[PDB]
Amino acid sequence: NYKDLAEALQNPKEVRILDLSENQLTILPKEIGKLQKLQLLDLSRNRLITLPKEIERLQNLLSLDLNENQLTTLPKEIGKLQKLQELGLSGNRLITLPKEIGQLKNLRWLSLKNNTALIPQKNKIQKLLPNTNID
Helix, strand or coil: CECCHHHHCCCCCCCCEEECCCCCCCCCCHHHHHCCCCCEEECCCCCCCCCCHHHHHCCCCCEEECCCCCCCCCCHHHHHCCCCCEEECCCCCCCCCCHHHHHCCCCCEEECCCCHHHHHHHHHHHHHCCCCEEC
16 A cells, blocks of 8 residues: 555555555656556546556556546557456546457446547447446
8 A cells, every 4th residue: 555656666566555646747657567466546636648558567456546637548558457447537638548448348437527529429438338337
């Protein structure tokens, strides 16, 4: 359980919960990929623009909170997060979602509120994630 990435990275295999919310982050360092036991990651209320492709290494991740950032795109590698059950994307600037998000077979909770560009894509997005509660 950590609130600091530098601190988490001193023993990357002991970190299961990481709360980096409200840390004014503009990038997520690719070193995040060494936290391979991570199960919950809170990145809400930062200034992120996208995610590194190394996010794919968080294979044990269950919840990913990116609410209230500045995200314009997600890498296709987001679809490799096989265990992911919750994804918070509210309040970003997303132009689209990658089709690979449909590979998230365990995704149950997805928040997309206040992503203007996605509003016309709603029905398409629900057909891509037909077992996901989408807010």
